[PDB]
Amino acid sequence: KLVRLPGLIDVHVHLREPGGTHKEDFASGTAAALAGGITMVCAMPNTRPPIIDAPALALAQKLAEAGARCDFALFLGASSENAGTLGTVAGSAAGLKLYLNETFSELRLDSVVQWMEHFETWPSHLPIVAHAEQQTVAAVLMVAQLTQRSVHICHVARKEEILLIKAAKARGLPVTCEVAPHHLFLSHDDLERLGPGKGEVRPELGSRQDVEALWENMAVIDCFASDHAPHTLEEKCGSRPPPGFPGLETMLPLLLTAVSEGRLSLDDLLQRLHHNPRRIFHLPPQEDTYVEVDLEHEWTIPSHMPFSKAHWTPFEGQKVKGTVRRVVLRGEVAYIDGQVLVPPGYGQDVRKWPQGAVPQLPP
Amino acid sequence: KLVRLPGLIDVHVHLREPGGTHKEDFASGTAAALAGGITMVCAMPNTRPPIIDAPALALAQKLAEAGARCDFALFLGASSENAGTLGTVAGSAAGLKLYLNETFSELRLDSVVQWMEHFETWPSHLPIVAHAEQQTVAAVLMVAQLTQRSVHICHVARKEEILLIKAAKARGLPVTCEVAPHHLFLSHDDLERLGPGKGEVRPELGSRQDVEALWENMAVIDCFASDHAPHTLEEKCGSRPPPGFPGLETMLPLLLTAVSEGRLSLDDLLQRLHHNPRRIFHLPPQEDTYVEVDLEHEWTIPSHMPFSKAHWTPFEGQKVKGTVRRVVLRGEVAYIDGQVLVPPGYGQDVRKWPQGAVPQLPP
Numbered sequence A, B: 001k002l003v004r005l006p007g008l009i010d011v012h013v014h015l016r017e018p019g020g021t022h023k024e025d026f027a028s029g030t031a032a033a034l035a036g037g038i039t040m041v042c043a044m045p046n047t048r049p050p051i052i053d054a055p056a057l058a059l060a061q062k063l064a065e066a067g068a069r070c071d072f073a074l075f076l077g078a079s080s081e082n083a084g085t086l087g088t089v090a091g092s093a094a095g096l097k098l099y100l101n102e103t104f105s106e107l108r109l110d111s112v113v114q115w116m117e118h119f120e121t122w123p124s125h126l127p128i129v130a131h132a133e134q135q136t137v138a139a140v141l142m143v144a145q146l147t148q149r150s151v152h153i154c155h156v157a158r159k160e161e162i163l164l165i166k167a168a169k170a171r172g173l174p175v176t177c178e179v180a181p182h183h184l185f186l187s188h189d190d191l192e193r194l195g196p197g198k199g200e201v202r203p204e205l206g207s208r209q210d211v212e213a214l215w216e217n218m219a220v221i222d223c224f225a226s227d228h229a230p231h232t233l234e235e236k237c238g239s240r241p242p243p244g245f246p247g248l249e250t251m252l253p254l255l256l257t258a259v260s261e262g263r264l265s266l267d268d269l270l271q272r273l274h275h276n277p278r279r280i281f282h283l284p285p286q287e288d289t290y291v292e293v294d295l296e297h298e299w300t301i302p303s304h305m306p307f308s309k310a311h312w313t314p315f316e317g318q319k320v321k322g323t324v325r326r327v328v329l330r331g332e333v334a335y336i337d338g339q340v341l342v343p344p345g346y347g348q349d350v351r352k353w354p355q356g357a358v359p360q361l362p363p
């Protein structure tokens, strides 16, 4: 007996096109998404060229329209030069991405004043998300308050961060957050097995206490999102390993395992991979779209999943229970038992749908 | 013709006793203060042992009472273990010091949650000051708002920081700040002359643009304070140079030079070295206390000033106009033209004066 789920949404993926297509491209990354029960993705802007201006966004839109197999929205990225220049294209993006710490990214800002400038100039009704670790979470929350708007915190990974956000929510501040599966299912205990190259990720893997704190504070977590960050094994194992884990194909099975163990409910999962992503980012429904999962199937994660060009996974050897059997996207069978059945280009930019524009007051 | 000033107050000095007395002690540091026209100092807690508990404070109080030549108050320092334990001695201190970044200091905290705990437990009516650079200023401002109280930011050094504080004040937030003379009178341009060891200080010396921004935003600066941070020349020039500059003997002459050039007024100076320190820290008046300065005397800063045991200065070679001629402290001549005339032990703990307790609602 299969369980029918709505089309799940991952608001944080790196699909590497343009410019890093040996790591992943729209076609392979969205195949990975479908195999993971995800029918809509929001792609980050730290590509080459990075998506920090209108011409780069135009290019990325066309590449995505030609290559994506599931539906998508594309983030714009904040830079040290583009505040006040994105107004005409802002509404066509998933939101604005701020990179506020060192990581795989034309996009660290030099000064909190540049963060302020972005918060002041980006349209007030559109989403802003931030890579903001440790004290940076408090700092960007301060900027959001000074500019009297909301902010969404990407991949919360630490007890420190989730408790800060918890305190902010208790004060009624407009902040939401997401957590990635590696920060729920891996910790320092796994670094011996992974090694120092494979183990590189930002935010870094946390202690057992960090992991336990995220679970204990599940009520504070608005979304799950993979931070799918594919790099090849050669890159991960080489002399300057880039941070990041692939995760689209493993996220839902890991979380289904947790549901089966009573660690969270099916509803808790659906709030975090469907309803809250929709409402935070004003993402439209997908008609005739659903995912069928088998909650009984026990399997062990192999050394690589079938679709991501990363061709490795940090979850190798973990025992999971739950698998994606079928995905239907807008009335077409998109995935069945290991086979993707929609071609590159089937996917659409949801921000171009009438129902996918973010509502705003007449300007 | 001399000008009579009130007794000036430096709310940020490191006097190194206990435990670093080759660098400075209460007797030498307060001689330096008097020679710089300063009659009251607030001493930081990063000594050895650090002033992070009641027994250490008791020791420091006695050492200061026996050695100080001018009046003083002693800060307590926040640690990872003492939140919620300082209530009985809190009112006897200048305030609570938080070290939130890497610098010469049992006292970096590991987590913003520890900052929160201090803001929640330290009595709400008593001062909190923070070493908080760049984004850390925004982060600690966020903690202050979450806990609905004020904060004072130490040694603001950057355009980024002063503009953030300016924006916070425009939103009516209870934040004050101080600036040290080296961030007004030295910059990157001086690093060649100083060299990499002598030039080490935290916050680091800023660009010309940082310096210009602090001057342009003088209205945002509540206090001047030296961050007198003496280390010996051997230490500054050695293989692991500690950050910090001595500054008590040079601060007032540098600022008087600026007054003479019309860069700020005598009133602007007195707000920042007398009236605002008094009101932010609830420091009492000193009866029969004044400083006489000669605004006409031109001189060049030598390779070391007479009193600080640091026996070096980063301001060597700068031409100044203005000198301290006489200091009277509580009816006794304390300093005349290079001679200190009050003994170690003349100085008193102002928090023990009836008028020096911080007022509070009956608890």
Ligand SMILES: NC(=O)N[C@@H](CC(=O)O)C(=O)O
Pocket: A014, A046, A103, A104, A105, A131, A200, A201, A202, A203, A227, A229, A230, A242, A243, A244, A245
């Ligand atoms: N998480 C990572 O370690 N790397 C991400 C960047 C990011 O999400 O910060 C990537 O794009 O590779």
Ligand SMILES: NC(=O)N[C@@H](CC(=O)O)C(=O)O
Pocket: B014, B046, B103, B104, B105, B131, B200, B201, B202, B203, B227, B229, B230, B242, B243, B244, B245
């Ligand atoms: N400013 C410095 O460079 N060092 C100070 C510490 C401090 O004020 O942060 C010191 O105590 O030496």
Ligand SMILES: [Zn+2]
Pocket: A103, A131, A154, A155, A202, A203
């Ligand atoms: Zn990130």
Ligand SMILES: [Zn+2]
Pocket: A011, A012, A129, A153, A154, A155, A178, A225
């Ligand atoms: Zn994110």
Ligand SMILES: [Zn+2]
Pocket: A012, A013, A014, A044, A227, A229
């Ligand atoms: Zn990312």
Ligand SMILES: [Zn+2]
Pocket: B103, B131, B154, B155, B202, B203
């Ligand atoms: Zn400091």
Ligand SMILES: [Zn+2]
Pocket: B011, B012, B129, B153, B154, B155, B178, B225
């Ligand atoms: Zn200070």
Ligand SMILES: [Zn+2]
Pocket: B012, B013, B014, B044, B227, B229
């Ligand atoms: Zn200091």
